[PDB]
Amino acid sequence: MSKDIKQVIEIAKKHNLFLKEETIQFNESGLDFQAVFAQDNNGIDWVLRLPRREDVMPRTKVEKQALDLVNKYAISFQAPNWIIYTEELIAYKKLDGVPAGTIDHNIGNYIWEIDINNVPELFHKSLGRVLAELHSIPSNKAAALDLVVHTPEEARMSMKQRMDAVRAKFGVGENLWNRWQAWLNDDDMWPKKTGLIHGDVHAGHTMIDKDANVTGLIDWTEAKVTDVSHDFIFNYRAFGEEGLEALILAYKEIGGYYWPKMKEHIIELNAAYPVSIAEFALVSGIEEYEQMAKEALEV
Numbered sequence: 001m002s003k004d005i006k007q008v009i010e011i012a013k014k015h016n017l018f019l020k021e022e023t024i025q026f027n028e029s030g031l032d033f034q035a036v037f038a039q040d041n042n043g044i045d046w047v048l049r050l051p052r053r054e055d056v057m058p059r060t061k062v063e064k065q066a067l068d069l070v071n072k073y074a075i076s077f078q079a080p081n082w083i084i085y086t087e088e089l090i091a092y093k094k095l096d097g098v099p100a101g102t103i104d105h106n107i108g109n110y111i112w113e114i115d116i117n118n119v120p121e122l123f124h125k126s127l128g129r130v131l132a133e134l135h136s137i138p139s140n141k142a143a144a145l146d147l148v149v150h151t152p153e154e155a156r157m158s159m160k161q162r163m164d165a166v167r168a169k170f171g172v173g174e175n176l177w178n179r180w181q182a183w184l185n186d187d188d189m190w191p192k193k194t195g196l197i198h199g200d201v202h203a204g205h206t207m208i209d210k211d212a213n214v215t216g217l218i219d220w221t222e223a224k225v226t227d228v229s230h231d232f233i234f235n236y237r238a239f240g241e242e243g244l245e246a247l248i249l250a251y252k253e254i255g256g257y258y259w260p261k262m263k264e265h266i267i268e269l270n271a272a273y274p275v276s277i278a279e280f281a282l283v284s285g286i287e288e289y290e291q292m293a294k295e296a297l298e299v
């Protein structure tokens with residue numbers, strides 16, 4: 001730990017980031033990297049990723065391309081800007097604010113920084129602005145993007161394929177499968193546009209100020225150009241229909257792509273949540289996710 005602190009200091013030093021030793025904090029980490037918070041010698045807070053795996057550049061290429069787009073175009077919110085980006089260290093200045101909530105992974109619950117029983121309307125207004133700006137970034141103007149890019153029909157066929165693959169692996173309850181298929185087959189419910197999405201929008205990744213304005217988004221690994229609807233699912237799951245409606249309203253009124261069955265579509269996408277849990281179970285090998293998936297698939 002003194003060894004680990006000493007190592008952090010040394011790695012940062014080699015990238016000309018000079019840290020106050022007493023401020024170094026090691027955070028909950030997965031297998032890709034160790035997450036660290038530290039303050040530099042000018043009093044500025046930083047976020048570091050210490051790599052735990054080889055091939056950092058290929059594995060971070062998509063996330064970095066997404067961040068490059070957001071930093072190039074977006075002004076209504078902050079995103080990580082990897083001023084230090086090498087195989088040995090990724091580091092960026094910490095975004096302002098705090099997460100709206102963080103997941104306690106043992107009860108399976110958010111620890112909220114807002115009042116869940118009286119959600120500030122500015123959360124929805126600000127997130128609506130943020131998402132409308134994000135989703136209208138002209139990703140097509142990049143010369144060489146490696147993000148997944150879907151047309152509207154490609155986004156629908158992607159879901160169709162993902163569902164078939166989960167069914168083949170785990171099975172799916174009959175009623176749930178029929179619901180998914182009815183959704184896939186309802187032409188008019190599907191969006192007729194796609195856009196650049198964050199892909200992991202939830203309270204842990206939405207940085208808020210003291211008034212619950214969303215001022216920043218972190219953790220862009222799931223970014224891609226596809227159905228914008230994924231970025232609305234958190235509002236529904238956390239806040240119910242009221243929170244979903246408030247976000248849709250804010251988004252629509254500031255100019256975001258809106259279609260008549262948008263709410264209905266997002267609710268059907270929410271019903272397809274088990275697809276994501278099943279995929280995560282398969283790729284992570286974490287038994288608890290396999291169990292959660294099988295329960296959610298109604299098998």
Ligand SMILES: CC[C@H]1OC(=O)[C@H](C)[C@@H](O[C@H]2C[C@@](C)(OC)[C@@H](O)[C@H](C)O2)[C@H](C)[C@@H](O[C@@H]2O[C@H](C)C[C@H](N(C)C)[C@H]2O)[C@](C)(O)C[C@@H](C)C(=O)[C@H](C)[C@@H](O)[C@]1(C)O
Nearest residue numbers: 103108109110199200201202230233234237238276277280
């Ligand atoms: C309401 C309260 C619940 O929160 C959600 O429903 C939100 C809104 C999910 O996002 C929703 C919405 C959405 C879009 O992600 C933001 C979607 O992809 C996922 C599947 O479900 C989250 C965050 C999911 O995480 C995401 O799961 C992905 C499989 C990978 C992703 N990430 C590491 C790449 C990761 O953040 C996931 C699975 O529910 C986390 C596990 C821990 C839970 O089961 C916990 C206990 C949740 O049930 C919850 C706290 O109770």
Ligand SMILES: [Ca+2]
Nearest residue numbers: 116117118119
């Ligand atoms: Ca209330």
